[PDB]
Amino acid sequence: IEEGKLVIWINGDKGYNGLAEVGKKFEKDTGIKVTVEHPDKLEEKFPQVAATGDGPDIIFWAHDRFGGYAQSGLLAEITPAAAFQAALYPFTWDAVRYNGKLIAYPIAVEALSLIYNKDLLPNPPKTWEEIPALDKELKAKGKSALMFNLQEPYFTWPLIAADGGYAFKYAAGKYDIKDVGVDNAGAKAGLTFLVDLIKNKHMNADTDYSIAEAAFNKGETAMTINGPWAWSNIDTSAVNYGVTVLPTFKGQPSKPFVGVLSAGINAASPNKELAKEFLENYLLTDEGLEAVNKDKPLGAVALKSYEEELAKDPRIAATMENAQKGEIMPNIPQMSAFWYAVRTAVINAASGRQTVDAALAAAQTNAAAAYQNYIAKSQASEAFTLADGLKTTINTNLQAGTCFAGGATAVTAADKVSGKYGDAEIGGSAPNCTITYTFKSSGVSNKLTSTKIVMNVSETGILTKNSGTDTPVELLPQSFVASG
Ligand SMILES: OC[C@H]1O[C@H](O[C@H]2[C@H](O)[C@@H](O)[C@@H](O[C@H]3[C@H](O)[C@@H](O)[C@@H](O)O[C@@H]3CO)O[C@@H]2CO)[C@H](O)[C@@H](O)[C@@H]1O
Ligand SMILES: [Ca+2]
Ligand SMILES: [Ca+2]
Ligand SMILES: [Ca+2]
C-alpha cells in the first residue's frame, strides 16, 4: 500500500463511477490521487491481501462482514467527533460497533423489495401462494411471473425466515452461536415452497443475478426481487416499474436481512488520516451521497440531512417497510460461515441432490467447517507480519556480507522472533536469504500444527513461496501461492 494515494474497493453492483467522481473532487482539492476498483469477490480477497500488507486503503461492503475483519486485526478503529456522529442515525452506528469499538463508517441501509412491471401486472400478489397460478396464466402469454437470483442466499432468505428460520438465536445480550435456526419446520416450509416452484417449472434452478435482471428489464418476467442498487438499470429500460412489500408466506411477512453498507479503513494503510478526511468531509455530505446515489441508488442513507429528501420517494418508503418487517444482520465473525452454509443448502435442495430436510440438517456442520477454515486462515497471517519485521533485519545484516546477525556470522544467532502461533527465523546464504515460520505443534488449528512457511526474499524485498513450504496451500494468500 503506497503512501500519498487512496485505493478504494467497492462491489461491482454499487455506484463506483459516482464514487470515483467524489474522489476526483478530493484529488483536485488535496492533490491526492484516488482510485476506485471493484475486483470480483473482493470481500474474500480483502483478508488475504491485507494479511500481507496490501489491498485497498478503504473497503466498502455490508456490515455483516466487518466483525470477522475486526476480529482478525485487519481494520483501524474509527474515532470521529460526537458532532460528526450526531449527523448520522444512531442505529446505523450500532451496526458498525464490534466489541465496544466503532470499526467502520455507516453509509446506507438497504433491504430487498418486490419489483413488478405495471403493464404486465397492475395489481401484484400479496402472497407467495398465488405466484404459481399466476405463472401458469402468464406462460400462456409467453411470459413468466417471477425471476430472481437463486445462486445467492441473500435473495432466498426472506422466504426461509418468513415462517420461523433464523441465523443465530439472540439470548439476552449475546448471540448463541451453536443455535443455528435453519433446521426447523418453519425454514423447511419456506425452502420446500421454493423447491416446488423449481419442480413445477415456474423457475429454473440455475437462474442467477444477470439472467433475472435481463429478463425483468426486457419485459420477459412480471416480477423480480432486488435492492435499491438495481433501480438505476430499470430506469433506462422500457419497463414501467413499482417497488412494494414482499409477499406474505403462510400469512406472515417475508423477513429480509437488512444490510448497512459500510466503509472501513485497512489496518496496514499508511494513509489513514487521508482516508478519514475523504469519508467524513467528502463522501458523507449531501453532495457526496447525491453523486453516488445518482449512479446506483443506495437505499435509505445514514446521513440525516440527505435522508430528509430521499424519504419522499415511494420506493424508499417500500424499502423501509421491508426493512422493518425483517432484521438487521449480525456482524459477528461467524456470519460468513453461516452464509456459506445456507448457500450450499439452497443449491443442493434446488438442484435435487438432497432433500430439503437433509440439506437443512447439514447446515450447522457445514458452517462449523467454514468457520474452522477462517480461524486457520487468520492464524496463518501472523507469518506475514513477523516476516515483515524480519526482512528489515535481513537488509541491515547484509552490510556485513551475510543474512545473519550483525557481523559476518556463519549461522543464525538471535535473528529469530516468537509469535502467538509459531516462531520465525532467517535462513539461506550469499544474497539468497530466506525466512521460515514454523507453527506450534499444538494451540493452533490442527490444519497448521507443525507446518512451515518458507519464503524467498528478493533484492527489492518481496516475499515469494519457497517449495519447502508445507502449510496447506489453500490456507495461504493466493498471491503468495501464485509466486510458487
Ligand atoms: O453466499 C456466499 C457469500 O456469503 C456472504 O455474502 C453475503 C454478504 O456478506 C451479505 O452482505 C449479503 O450480500 C448482499 C449485499 O448485502 C448487497 O448489498 C448486494 O451486494 O447483494 C449481496 C448478495 O449477493 O448476502 C451475501 C449472501 O448472499 C459472504 O460475505 C461472501 O463472501 C460469500 O461469497
Ligand atoms: Ca401502460
Ligand atoms: Ca469465511
Ligand atoms: Ca460449504
From Swiss-Prot:
| Principal localisation | periplasm
* SUPFAM superfamilies noted in UniProt: Periplasmic binding protein-like II
Keywords of the record:
Periplasm, Signal, Sugar transport, Transport
MF GO annotations: carbohydrate transmembrane transporter activity; maltose binding
Gene Ontology cellular component list: ATP-binding cassette (ABC) transporter complex; ATP-binding cassette (ABC) transporter complex, substrate-binding subunit-containing; maltose transport complex; membrane; outer membrane-bounded periplasmic space; periplasmic space
Q: Which GO terms describe its biological process?
A: carbohydrate transport; cell chemotaxis; detection of maltose stimulus; DNA damage response; maltodextrin transmembrane transport; maltose transport
Q: What turns on expression?
A: Induced by maltose and the transcriptional regulator MalT. Permanently repressed by cold shock in a PNPase-dependent fashion.
On the tree of life, the source organism's domain of life is: Bacteria
Keyword Transport assigned to the entry: answer is yes
Q: Where in the cell is it found?
A: Periplasm
Q: Which Pfam families match?
A: SBP_bac_1
- Homology family: Belongs to the bacterial solute-binding protein 1 family.
Stated role: Part of the ABC transporter complex MalEFGK involved in maltose/maltodextrin import. Binds maltose and higher maltodextrins such as maltotriose.
List the NCBIfam families hit by this protein, alphabetically: PRK09474.1
Please describe the quaternary structure of this protein: The complex is composed of two ATP-binding proteins (MalK), two transmembrane proteins (MalG and MalF) and a solute-binding protein (MalE).
Q: What is this protein called?
A: Maltose/maltodextrin-binding periplasmic protein
- What is this protein's gene name? malE
